[PDB]
Design an enzyme around this catalytic site. Structure first.
Site, short mmCIF file in Angstrom:
data_model
loop_
_atom_site.label_atom_id
_atom_site.label_comp_id
_atom_site.label_asym_id
_atom_site.label_seq_id
_atom_site.Cartn_x
_atom_site.Cartn_y
_atom_site.Cartn_z
N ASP A 118 0.83 -1.19 0.00
CA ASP A 118 0.00 0.00 0.00
C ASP A 118 0.87 1.25 0.00
O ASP A 118 1.76 1.40 0.85
CB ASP A 118 -0.93 0.00 1.22
CG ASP A 118 -1.93 1.13 1.20
OD1 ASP A 118 -1.98 1.88 0.19
OD2 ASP A 118 -2.68 1.28 2.19
N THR A 149 -4.46 6.53 -4.70
CA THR A 149 -3.57 7.47 -4.03
C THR A 149 -2.23 7.58 -4.75
O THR A 149 -1.72 8.68 -4.96
CB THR A 149 -3.36 7.05 -2.57
OG1 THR A 149 -4.63 7.04 -1.89
CG2 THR A 149 -2.42 8.01 -1.86
N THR A 150 -1.65 6.44 -5.13
CA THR A 150 -0.37 6.46 -5.84
C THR A 150 -0.51 7.00 -7.26
O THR A 150 0.48 7.46 -7.83
CB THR A 150 0.23 5.06 -5.88
OG1 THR A 150 -0.67 4.16 -6.54
CG2 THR A 150 0.50 4.55 -4.47
N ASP A 207 -13.95 1.94 2.49
CA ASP A 207 -13.38 1.98 1.15
C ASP A 207 -14.40 1.55 0.10
O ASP A 207 -14.30 1.96 -1.06
CB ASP A 207 -12.14 1.09 1.08
CG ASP A 207 -10.97 1.66 1.86
OD1 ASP A 207 -11.01 2.86 2.21
OD2 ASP A 207 -10.02 0.90 2.14
#
Lengths: 508, 524, 521
Positions: free
Chosen positions: A43, A76-77, A376
């Site tokens: 993650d 997010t990445t 999520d």
């Protein structure tokens, strides 16, 4: 010019390392801590927080990942890598080509608007009112997790959790409210041990574990009225220095009479409106139980302050400090159900777009994994209600912008035309990164995929399982458009702020 | 990663050539170890005067010399274009594209470019060899070298070319113009406005005799004698010595009557000029003064080759045999003062048309004197390019050629499927170095002139037929301007033979560098 | 401790102000960009203001600490132009150090600046002018247009600026002995859904948002003269308290006397914050008095100043009860009520002394009007600060460029070794437009050069009192990339800000050049 190079290499060094954290095929990473432990998870949100950085440009990229992680669960990445590749493609233009940075910043603002219009055309309409369709949209965040056994029940539980907070309202009079959906405060859940997952329902209101303070009282009220207050009901004291010294034997009865009067006078302020319920933030002494018993109202003590804000949504009672200032507009009228009936060996209460979801399961350890998995899962369903459109995954949306940007930039004929080619190359690196992790040839699969956009549609992405060019729609690969909108907008806005600092000032 | 550092080694010499092409170009002073300073603006000549360390640099030097030997023009276009092909290929190496497909991509893009050169021809040179017609070809050659001399040197060079060319048309079988037909001489004093055009070689030395010049008679006979002037003796040894004073009177008077007898037979044949390649004795100059024969000494054997092609004279291995069949004929020869010193020149009138001419240069600047000498030699080979191999066709210059090819190459990029699209797109971008170099060295802003160049060749016209102006090139400015201007106003064009030949050389130059992944060296 | 002197300390002063000038070089003007300050702790900050950067700037140097106190002096008073002061003082130190090789004495350099400073103020006062071009041209219009260019309102700001400028133009009043000072908060803006956003109409007067409650009352009464009674005390039946659980004629008899003092005072307009009961409303029908229920407390306090009335706290003052007739009643012309879409407002015009007005912005929805109302106050802030000072000067480099050419010929009239110091002082002002064009991506060498060409012929025919094609006040517009007048472009700055910025810039430059020795233990 060395300061502009250090600003680009600072954000790119963080983005180049997390390139392997994208996609379901993302490779694991290993960080070396001073302690014997290590981080085995892939993650990106957990890895970036444990990385020590020096140049301040990397610190600004960490704050962006924290805000992006709160809006949506995944991607997010993607924002960090996209923001770092734009500076990489603009590195030879800013240094070697000697292009002014504001020209690049001004061009990114114009390209941000054109990038959003292309995604809207590639997106396809979807019905948000279909309950069977929303379960499949959430299922992408359900499977391949511990909840796979409850996946049938999780799709129904996550469906009603989203349907509770959302309300459909629109018009041209007051504007577009955008449904006013907040996952943090309103969708906040309270895990209660015991019960069943299938029998778990979503109640609208605030749930308290405090029961009735009297043994014999009516447990069903037709029209109960919730009243909120701050100052507790009990014997008070003087604000200044008070000296109480009892000497004579007959002086003990004076304090007993004053103690009964101070409690009765505080109750008369509440009885002005004659409410059907009395709720106190702090505790309530046993003396006020008999005074309010004849008034036909229940006493409820030990109520949290954070829960009082959500009560005003189901009731309307305004928080009032002094009991003498309590308005009559705070009545709790039109309350649905007063039933206090115990469920799961714990006394409950029914106060029914703000609420507290009651979670029930086989044990506390089971509900702990459901917590982060349900939050999520609702982020994907929330993006569906923001607009009835879905985008192709696997990098098809990333390729759709680069194709339309190169053709439209040729007709502008201006100084901004050169950085548009750098943006189109940065948009192609996101799907190409998954190609390097899929084992396929990054040179061959990139040129063959780009040529298909001129002939076929823009929904054709890259599959992680297979590794060959395939269609995303026919094989059931979909992603919401809101993530695509937040990934392009936040990455461009963050990339412009990094180019605005030409000098690093050292000082306090 | 030495293949990346190999480009950086050429990049150090790349900026040296970027300051050469264009009007901002300047000569480089190089002091040889022998105490001789060679100063020239041409970059190909400088490569021979520079010490090369890395052997990969010699690859571009060998390709640069090919441009000077054959076409003689475009040496700066080959080196600069070959250096840019390595920069656009460096991004493909970091991208992960193999250098094998990069080489294959240039071969496909080269064949597509050569086919489009025939459709870009605007005008056609009729090869009239007129003084006004040659001004269009010579002007861009002198341009981007020396400023201010383009107007004066245009009439001097174009006039000397028409003198050595006969009258013919539509005949390419027999060659006429050579590379030695134009010689450049220099003299101290004067200016460029006082310079004239001579129809023959110019001799700056002294006649070494009391006869300054010959008469006005038609068809002066000129004889070239390789044997020195002296009494005939045995070829083996034969050193004249005096044993006693009695033989002194016989040997002294013997050489006087022997030389005078040979000079009398030459003067009776009508030969007014004697060319002696070797030294001349003291008693030989006394007899030539009364006969009125001009004394000329040419020790250099290279100058005698161009002299035989004019008057028709032939070198004689012996002395005293004036064969009239091998003698030369010149219409008029005169000795005049040009540049402050009296010298004996060589010219003609009507008959015996000279195949070699010489232009006399004058000026008060020593640095600019040798610069024009090397600049005219670049214009000599421009006339040679007028022959059958695409001599009449021409393309617009001043950066308009490299910019126009961008729209045509990118159109064929999406047409050819496969991985070749990466090399085709980078092949057209590599042509942007030519307009950027002229705009950067001229002080013009990149954010201003460069975006106007793309909008000049790319416009929206509601129709299939092109219109407006496609002739807008790169302007040097220097005073003021708005946008760009038409190149057809100044008539600056580039020949097809020069541009087409420079593409094949520059393509194979960058191909060799990209194909070499390993270099082995050894210390000497 | 160590002791230094000679040319070594003079070179350290230039290197010290060079790094300080580079910090404020990119922050000059609104086109500047933000910067980050990283300390040893590792924290940082993001701000576009160069004044806050100099406060936290850590520099160890005797001349460097002088600019620290100079930056705080401009912030505590003017609060603007601190960035331009540091740039001017930085170039003066670089050019003064070059005169050392010319054997120029530093006192002559200082004396040359003091003489040129007093003479420059006289030249600036000659080109100063008040607000002009009100008829036939537009000045204040382009100020709000450039400020709203970042919002949707900027597209319609052309029609909106005409209503704001005309309103604020008449707001000026004598105040105390002809002060003519504009208030910081005025012109209350309302919102409505009527028609489109471009249909908003200016109301020359006060406008209150409220209804008439019962419609049985006439909407138009007392055309000739009308009196507005501002009463914070309600006319509704008075109760004990909201927290007292429950005399009739006592509470009902108080409101009957309060209305008796109204109809007898001749007040056709009655405002009640808490509303009016039904019993007191019947008496207003026969008297044709227009009542208003649920008034806003913040609205009535401004009505007393606009209508000349006074807010009444309570009617229980002393032992009497009454409305103080004719004492609190102001002079008004007519109160007319026009029917509006969605919510209806009240129009009050022709009061005793108002000079103000109300702008009602109508649009599609209240979501856009909330952003337009907040952006209007930000755009009005730039306008009210410029109009606050009656003496204004065009900015954008007009002060530094026009003075550069004037000091060229004026330096000859002084002479005596002081001419070289004046020439370097005038040439040091070209750095302000230079570095300003850097953040605008424009070429700083062409703009500064071409700007001197236009000002050259501007001062040739100026003393002759005759001109044809020669105009003054040539500015620099970096948004459109062209040379236009800053008066019409919308860039205006007060004179007080420019005079104190130039005078204080030279005060710090003198103390730096007078230090020939640095002694540190």
């Amino acid at each position: 010019r060395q300061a502009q190079i250090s600003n680009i290499t600072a954000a790119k060094a963080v983005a180049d390392v997390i390139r392997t954290c994208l996609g379901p095929k993302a490779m694991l990473k290993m960080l070396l801590d001073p302690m014997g432990g290590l981080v085995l998870t892939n993650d990106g949100h957990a890895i970036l927080r444990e990385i020590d950085v020096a140049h301040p440009a990397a610190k600004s990229m960490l704050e962006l990942s924290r805000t992006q992680d709160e809006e949506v669960g995944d991607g997010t990445t993607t924002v960090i890598i996209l923001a770092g590749e734009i500076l990489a493609q603009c590195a030879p233009y800013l240094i070697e080509k000697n292009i002014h940075p504001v020209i690049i910043i001004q061009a990114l603002k114009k390209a941000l608007t054109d990038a959003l219009e292309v995604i809207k055309q590639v997106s396809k309409p979807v019905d948000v009112e279909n309950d069977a369709a929303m379960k499949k949209l959430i299922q992408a965040s359900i499977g391949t997790k511990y909840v796979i056994h409850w996946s049938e029940k999780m799709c129904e539980l996550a469906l009603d959790a989203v349907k509770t907070v959302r309300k459909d309202l629109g018009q041209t009079v007051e504007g577009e409210p955008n449904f006013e959906i907040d996952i943090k405060r309103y969708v906040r859940v309270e895990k209660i041990p015991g019960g069943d997952v299938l029998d778990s329902r979503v109640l609208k209101g605030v749930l308290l574990n405090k029961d009735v303070v009297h043994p014999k009282m009516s447990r069903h009220i037709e029209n109960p009225r919730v009243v909120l207050l701050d100052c507790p009901l009990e014997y008070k004291k003087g604000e200044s220095q008070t000296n109480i010294e009892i000497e004579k034997e007959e002086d003990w009865n004076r304090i007993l009479q004053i103690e009964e009067e101070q409690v009765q006078l505080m109750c008369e302020q509440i009885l002005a409106v004659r409410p059907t319920l009395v709720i106190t933030e702090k505790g309530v002494s046993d003396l006020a139980q008999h005074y309010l018993l004849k008034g036909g109202c229940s006493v409820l003590r030990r109520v949290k302050k954070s829960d009082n804000n959500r009560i005003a949504r189901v009731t309307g009672a305004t928080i009032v400090n002094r009991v003498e200032d309590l308005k009559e507009s705070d009545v709790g009228t039109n309350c649905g159900l007063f039933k206090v009936e115990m469920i799961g060996d714990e006394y409950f209460s029914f106060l029914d777009k703000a609420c507290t979801i009651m979670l029930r399961g086989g044990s506390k350890d089971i509900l702990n994994e459901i917590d982060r998995n349900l939050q999520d899962a609702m982020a994907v369903a929330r993006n569906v209600m923001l607009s009835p459109s879905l985008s192709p995954g696997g990098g098809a949306t990333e390729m759709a912008v680069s194709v339309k940007l190169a053709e439209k930039a040729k007709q502008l004929e201006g100084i901004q035309q050169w950085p548009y080619q750098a943006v189109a190359d940065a948009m192609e690196c996101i799907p190409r990164t998954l190609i390097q992790n899929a084992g396929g040839d990054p040179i061959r699969l990139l040129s063959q995929l780009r040529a298909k956009h001129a002939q076929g549609n823009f929904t054709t992405g890259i599959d992680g399982d297979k590794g060959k060019i395939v269609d995303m729609v026919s094989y059931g690969i979909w992603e919401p458009e809101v993530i695509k909108q937040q990934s392009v907008k936040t990455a461009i806005e963050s990339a412009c702020l990094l180019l605005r600092v030409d000098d690093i000032v050292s000082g306090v | 990663g030495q293949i990346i550092k190999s480009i950086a080694a050429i990049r150090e010499l790349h900026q040296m050539c970027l300051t050469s092409m264009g009007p901002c170009g300047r000569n480089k002073i190089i002091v040889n170890h022998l105490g001789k300073i060679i100063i020239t603006n041409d970059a190909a000549t400088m490569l021979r005067e520079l010490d090369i360390v890395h052997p990969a640099v010699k690859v571009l030097v060998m390709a640069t010399e090919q441009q000077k030997i054959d076409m003689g023009d475009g040496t700066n276009l080959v080196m600069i274009l070959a250096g840019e092909l390595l920069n656009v290929s460096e991004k493909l190496i970091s991208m992960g594209l193999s250098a094998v497909e990069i080489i294959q991509g240039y071969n496909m893009a080269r064949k597509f470019t050569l086919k489009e050169l025939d459709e870009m021809v605007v005008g056609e040179i009729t090869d009239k060899n007129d003084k006004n017609e040659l001004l269009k070809m010579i002007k861009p050659v002198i341009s981007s070298k020396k400023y201010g001399s383009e107007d004066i040197l245009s009439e001097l060079v174009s006039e000397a070319v028409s003198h050595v060319l006969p009258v013919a048309q539509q005949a390419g079988e027999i060659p006429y113009f050579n590379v030695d037909s134009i010689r450049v001489v220099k003299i101290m004093g004067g200016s460029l406005s006082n310079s004239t055009v001579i129809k023959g070689m110019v001799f700056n030395r002294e006649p070494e005799g009391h006869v300054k010049s010959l008469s006005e008679d038609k068809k002066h006979k000129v004889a070239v004698f390789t044997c020195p002037l002296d009494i005939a003796n045995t070829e083996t040894k034969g050193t004249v010595l005096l044993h006693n004073a009695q033989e002194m009177l016989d040997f002294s008077k013997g050489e006087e009557k022997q030389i005078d007898a040979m000079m009398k037979e030459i003067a009776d044949m009508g030969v007014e000029c004697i060319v002696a390649g070797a030294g001349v004795g003291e008693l030989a100059l006394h007899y030539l003064n009364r006969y009125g024969i001009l004394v000329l000494k040419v020790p250099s054997k290279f100058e005698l080759r161009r002299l035989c092609r004019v008057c028709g004279a032939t070198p004689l291995p012996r002395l005293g045999a004036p064969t009239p069949e091998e003698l030369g004929l010149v219409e008029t020869v005169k000795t005049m003062e040009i540049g402050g010193d009296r010298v004996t020149v060589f010219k003609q009138e009507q008959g015996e048309i000279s195949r070699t001419s010489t232009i006399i240069l004058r000026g008060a600047t020593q640095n600019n004197l040798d610069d024009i000498e090397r600049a005219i030699d670049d214009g000599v080979a421009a006339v040679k390019g007028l022959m059958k191999p695409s001599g009449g066709k021409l393309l617009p210059g001043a950066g308009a050629t490299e910019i126009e090819l961008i729209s045509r190459i990118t159109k064929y990029g999406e047409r050819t499927p496969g991985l070749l699209q990466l090399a085709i797109k980078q092949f057209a971008v590599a042509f942007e170095v030519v307009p950027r170099t002229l705009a950067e060295t001229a002080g013009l802003d990149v954010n201003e002139v460069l975006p106007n160049l793309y909008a000049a060749h790319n416009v929206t016209e509601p129709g299939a037929v092109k219109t407006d102006h496609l002739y807008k090139g790169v302007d040097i400015d220097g005073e003021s301007d708005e946008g760009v201007k038409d190149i057809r106003e100044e008539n600056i064009y580039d020949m097809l033979a020069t541009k087409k030949f420079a593409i094949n050389v520059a393509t194979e130059a960058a191909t060799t560098v990209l194909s070499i992944d390993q270099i082995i060296m050894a210390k000497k | 401790g160590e002791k230094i002197s000679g040319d070594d300390i003079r070179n350290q002063n230039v290197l010290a102000t060079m790094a300080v000038a580079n910090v404020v070089k990119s922050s000059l003007g609104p086109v500047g960009l933000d910067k980050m300050l990283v300390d040893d702790i590792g924290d940082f900050t993001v701000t576009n203001d160069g004044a806050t950067i100099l406060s936290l700037l850590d520099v160890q140097h005797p001349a460097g600490k002088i600019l620290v106190e100079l930056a705080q002096q401009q912030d505590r008073e003017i609060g603007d132009g601190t960035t331009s002061v540091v740039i001017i003082a930085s170039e003066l130190l670089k050019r003064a150090n070059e005169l050392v090789k010319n054997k120029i004495h530093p006192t002559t350099i200082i004396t040359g600046f003091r003489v040129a400073l007093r003479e420059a103020i006289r030249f600036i006062n000659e080109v100063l002018s008040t607000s002009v071009d009100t008829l036939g041209k537009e000045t204040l219009i382009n100020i709000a247009k450039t400020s709203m260019s970042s919002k949707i309102i900027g597209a319609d700001s052309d029609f909106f600026s005409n209503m704001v400028v005309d309103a604020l133009l008449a707001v000026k009043t004598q105040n105390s002995k002809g002060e003519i000072k504009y208030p910081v908060k005025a012109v209350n803006v309302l919102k409505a859904h009527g028609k489109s956003a471009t249909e908003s109409l200016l109301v020359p007067g006060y406008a209150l948002n409220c209804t008439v409650a019962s419609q049985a009352m006439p909407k138009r009464i007392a055309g000739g003269n009308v009196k507005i009674a501002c009463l914070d005390l309600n006319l509704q039946k008075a109760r004990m308290a909201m927290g007292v659980q429950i005399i009739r004629k006592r509470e009902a008899g108080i409101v009957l006397e309060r209305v008796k003092k109204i109809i007898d005072a001749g007040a056709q307009v009655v405002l009640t914050t808490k509303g009016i009961d039904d019993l007191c409303l019947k008496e207003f029908v026969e008297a044709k008095i227009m009542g208003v229920r649920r008034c806003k407390k913040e609205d009535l306090r401004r009505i007393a100043r606009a209508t000349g009335a006074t807010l009444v706290s309570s009617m229980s003052n002393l032992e009497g009860e009454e409305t103080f007739e004719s004492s609190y009643l102001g002079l008004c012309d007519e109160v007319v009520q026009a029917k509006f879409s969605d919510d209806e407002c009240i129009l009050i015009k022709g009061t005793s002394k108002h000079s103000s007005s109300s702008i009602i912005l109508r649009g599609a929805n209240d979501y856009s009007l909330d952003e337009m109302e907040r952006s209007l106050h930000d755009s009005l802030s730039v306008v009210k600060r410029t109009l606050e000072s009656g003496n204004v000067v065009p900015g954008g480099g007009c002060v530094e460029a026009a003075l550069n050419i004037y000091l060229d010929n004026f330096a000859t009239t002084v002479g005596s070794r002081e001419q070289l110091a004046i020439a370097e002082f005038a040439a040091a002002l070209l750095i302000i437009p230079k570095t300003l064009a850097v953040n605008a991506a424009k070429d700083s060498s062409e703009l500064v050069a071409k700007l001197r060409s236009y000002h050259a012929a501007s001062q040739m025919a100026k003393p002759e009192d005759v001109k044809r094609r020669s105009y003054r006040n040539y500015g620099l517009d970096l948004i459109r990339g062209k040379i236009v007048d800053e008066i019409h472009a919308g860039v205006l700055e007060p004179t007080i800000s420019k005079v104190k910025s130039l005078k204080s810039a030279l005060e710090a430059c003198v103390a730096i050049l007078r230090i020939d020795t640095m002694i540190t233990v």
